[PDB]
Amino acid sequence: PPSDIAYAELYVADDREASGFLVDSLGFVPLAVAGPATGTHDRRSTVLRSGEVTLVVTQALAPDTPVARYVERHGDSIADLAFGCDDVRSCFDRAVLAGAEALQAPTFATVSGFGDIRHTLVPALLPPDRDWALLPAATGRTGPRPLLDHVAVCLESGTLRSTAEFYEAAFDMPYYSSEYIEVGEQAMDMIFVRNAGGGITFTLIEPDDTRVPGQIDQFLSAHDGPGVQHLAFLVDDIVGSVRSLGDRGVAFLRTPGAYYDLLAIEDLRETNVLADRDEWGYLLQIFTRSPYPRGTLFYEYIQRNGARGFGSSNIKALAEAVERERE
Numbered sequence: 028p029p030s031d032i033a034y035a036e037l038y039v040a041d042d043r044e045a046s047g048f049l050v051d052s053l054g055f056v057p058l059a060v061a062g063p064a065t066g067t068h069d070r071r072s073t074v075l076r077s078g079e080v081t082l083v084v085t086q087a088l089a090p091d092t093p094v095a096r097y098v099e100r101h102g103d104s105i106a107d108l109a110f111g112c113d114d115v116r117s118c119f120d121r122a123v124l125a126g127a128e129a130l131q132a133p134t135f136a137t138v139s140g141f142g143d144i145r146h147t148l149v150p151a152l153l154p155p156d157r158d159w160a161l162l163p164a165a166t167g168r169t170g171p172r173p174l175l176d177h178v179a180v181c182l183e184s185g186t187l188r189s190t191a192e193f194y195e196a197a198f199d200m201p202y203y204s205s206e207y208i209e210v211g212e213q214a215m216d217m218i219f220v221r222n223a224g225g226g227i228t229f230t231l232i233e234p235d236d237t238r239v240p241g242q243i244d245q246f247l248s249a250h251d252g253p254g255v256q257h258l259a260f261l262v263d264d265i266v267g268s269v270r271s272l273g274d275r276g277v278a279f280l281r282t283p284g285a286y287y288d289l290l291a292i293e294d295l296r297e298t299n300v301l302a303d304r305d306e307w308g309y310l311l312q313i314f315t316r317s318p319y320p321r322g323t324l325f326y327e328y329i330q331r332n333g334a335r336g337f338g339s340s341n342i343k344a345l346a347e348a349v350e351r352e353r354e
């Protein structure tokens with residue numbers, strides 16, 4: 028089965044705006060591009076990289092193409108979470124066996140997943156379905172950080188268990204941990220799934236329909252269905268990163284000073300970074316505001332100092348920061 032996430036592909040209405048924020052604010056570097064001059068007539072795509080995180084930003088160049096249809100439905104959104112496989116044929120078979128729809132058969136392959144996401148399957152390197160014109164930066168060595176810590180996915184009520192069962196069977200990503208999180212009168216249920224290697228961690232999040240609609244329901248109506256709510260990037264110095272990023276225009280969600288009174292500490296306070304711990308050490312986390320029109324996808328920065336999993340105290344204070352922002 029898949030060892031790692033190869034890349035995430037963002038479908039967008041305006042790649043100037045979307046890639047501009049990822050490059051000029053977050054610091055991603057363009058590596059390669061595809062478009063009419065490389066034989067890809069219906070869209071322009073750009074591969075961006077930072078450390079080991081690869082994002083592909085893709086914009087339709089004609090109305091009523093699949094990309095254009097996707098973006099009209101969902102807004103700017105992740106449409107593809109690509110898996111790197113030691114043996115693609117084997118990954119594809121195991122996935123179809125588990126009930127994954129065959130969206131394109133091994134010509135590299137594409138299977139379905141939660142909501143209308145795609146999972147392109149690729150050798151564990153740029154996407155294999157299009158031909159790429161390289162930038163000079165593509166020919167140079169990349170840092171080991173940042174790396175993609177986990178992907179958070181919003182699911183419709185009553186689909187959490189069967190989504191998790193699918194990911195266990197299709198991709199060998201079994202249960203890792205679960206949390207039930209309450210904010211005000213709303214709540215959400217989540218399961219973290221993770222493969223044996225630890226290369227792939229998803230947060231599967233469903234809203235609790237026995238409580239009052241909240242931020243997960245809002246995500247689902249804005250995005251118009253299940254989708255990726257956030258990508259989290261693992262960094263060595265989240266305080267430093269949040270300082271430089273803040274300088275390049277990045278808006279992070281704020282936490283009240285109250286939280287810091289309870290809880291180095293002056294550094295976290297200043298940066299609105301959240302701290303929690305597991306049996307093996309601490310983790311620091313922060314969310315950015317969504318930079319997209321519908322207020323859906325956003326980014327997370329995480330630093331692990333020994334922590335292997337996730338802390339229920341950070342999850343709650345993150346979800347509180349999103350609600351303060353939502354209002």
Ligand SMILES: O=C(O)[C@H](O)c1ccccc1
Nearest residue numbers: 179230232337342345346
């Ligand atoms: O970062 C995490 O622990 C996790 O993906 C998460 C999901 C939903 C709200 C807050 C946090």
Ligand SMILES: [Co+2]
Nearest residue numbers: 179257259327
């Ligand atoms: Co997260």
